[PDB]
Design a protein around this ligand. Sequence first.
Ligand code: ATP
Ligand code: ATP
Ligand code: MG
Ligand code: MG
Ligand code: MG
Ligand code: MG
Lengths: 287, 289
Amino acid sequence: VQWSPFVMSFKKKYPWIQLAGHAGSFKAAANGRILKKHCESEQRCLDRLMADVLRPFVPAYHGDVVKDGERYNQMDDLLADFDSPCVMDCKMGVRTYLEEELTKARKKPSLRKDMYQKMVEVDPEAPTEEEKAQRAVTKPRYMQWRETISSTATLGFRIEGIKKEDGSVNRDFKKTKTREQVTEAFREFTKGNQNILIAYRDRLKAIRATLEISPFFKCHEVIGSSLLFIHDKKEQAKVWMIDFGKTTPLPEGQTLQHDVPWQEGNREDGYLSGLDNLIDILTEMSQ
Amino acid sequence: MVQWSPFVMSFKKKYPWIQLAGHAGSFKAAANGRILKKHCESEQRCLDRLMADVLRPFVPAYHGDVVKDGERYNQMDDLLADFDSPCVMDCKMGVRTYLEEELTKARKKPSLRKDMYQKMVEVDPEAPTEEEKAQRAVTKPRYMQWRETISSTATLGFRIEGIKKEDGSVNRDFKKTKTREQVTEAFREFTKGNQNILIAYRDRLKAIRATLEISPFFKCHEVIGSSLLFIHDKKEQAKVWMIDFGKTTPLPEGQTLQHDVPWQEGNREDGYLSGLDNLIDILTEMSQG
Ligand SMILES: Nc1ncnc2c1ncn2[C@@H]1O[C@H](COP(=O)(O)OP(=O)(O)OP(=O)(O)O)[C@@H](O)[C@H]1O
Ligand SMILES: Nc1ncnc2c1ncn2[C@@H]1O[C@H](COP(=O)(O)OP(=O)(O)OP(=O)(O)O)[C@@H](O)[C@H]1O
Ligand SMILES: [Mg+2]
Ligand SMILES: [Mg+2]
Ligand SMILES: [Mg+2]
Ligand SMILES: [Mg+2]
């Protein structure tokens, strides 16, 4: 040392931000790490992905752990290098349920009352005539219908939640469906900050380029996963792929396209269709 | 609100501490953004008094003393704690860096000093009298006083002791840094000409001035050897604190100093405010252009 006789260390704190998920799914950990409640198919995905070209676009995974009588997966906190970050969560795919979940619910189709009540609540004209005469509905047709009230079926993604600069959270995007509404949310999220737009736009392009190469990707049905956008007042802006609770490997030597329409049986998820429109919306906003 | 944050996350902030002046082993790491400085009796006496004075908010918080590993320390805040990659400058304040008692003492056995002559002739071959040249010796007296002259101490009432810049480079050769031009130059580089950083520095200096004018501690202390420590970062957080009271001593009771007046043997005046006014002119002049 010409000038430094010792190193200094002390702790600082920042509030973690949880948009989607339930109370209890997450806990704080040391060294920028986070504990998400353990889920086997998520752990499989995170192991395969640590080794895949997509690695730079997902939080670093560090294995399962046992804390206070429960199992967790340990990963990085993507909030760590940000300061007072804003955050947006977008669920990816033209669909948010696995084919095996539809199959399974198609195997014993018990007529559902509340599912009818919720469906009329959101659109009184949604039910067919027979379904109207029944004041009830199938889990099947409902799972399928739910995807339609927001941008999921038309755009291949939907907004799960937004935490903004004033410190307010929005989570009610159940009827957020059009390009106009989405752009509008993206515009408020971002304060029209052009640098942040372009950054998000370029980050997404990189993710998309890699998804094309990615061995892991071509063989998973990537359902229930999200893009997590994080930006702060310093105009740092990144996007990551998170949430692999419902992403599952195809059988051996088999593959998905991810940009073609889902037909029941083909397991296609529309993930690239989702990502393509996201890329289009930001390009336009970023002009 | 409880609407979005299930828990708090924590992280270690880690940074190399910066020592511009002082000797090796004068300082140690402590926890919680604190630092230990090797114990000094008049410094501790100063800090206690400053913890109970208006000047408190402009000096490192003092937390008392502590014995570790065979040594006594004064515990204090690390003024670097909440900056991001700090740049630091230490300016030693006053028209003199020796106390009056130090001089009186030296004037006592005022024997000849070969070494002091040799340092003087090294720094300036034209400083010694013909008598001193011929004797290859100076007194201590003469040497102590001449020493103040080679930098801006005797004329401007301060001198730069060190700078660590955004480069991660550290300068300490301000031995012949004398003129207002040289100083402006150093500040300009230290600051990279940043207007915002300059104005904050300037206004933080003016606030300091305004509190000294009302400080019962300040007005009855011979304030020697203390520094103004400038710290700023890339986020343009910029501050200045008074530091180092190892050689700051109380005047006799019921007795006072002006601090903006010239020094004369026996008047104990340190010229502290003169130095501070100059720092303010320089920093104001720079914050225009
Ligand atoms: N690694 C991470 N870094 C930072 N924030 C994260 C991370 N993982 C999750 N989050 C935050 O936690 C929330 C929950 O994430 P996630 O979607 O994985 O949970 P979940 O239990 O799988 O919920 P769901 O299955 O309903 O999507 C996200 O919406 C996001 O705000
Ligand atoms: N509280 C503090 N916070 C941050 N830095 C400090 C603090 N105190 C001292 N320093 C740093 O340590 C250096 C030396 O401090 P100081 O002048 O008090 O030491 P010293 O032993 O009294 O030396 P000298 O008597 O030679 O001035 C300063 O140049 C400054 O960089
Ligand atoms: Mg999710
Ligand atoms: Mg999930
Ligand atoms: Mg000092
Ligand atoms: Mg000292």
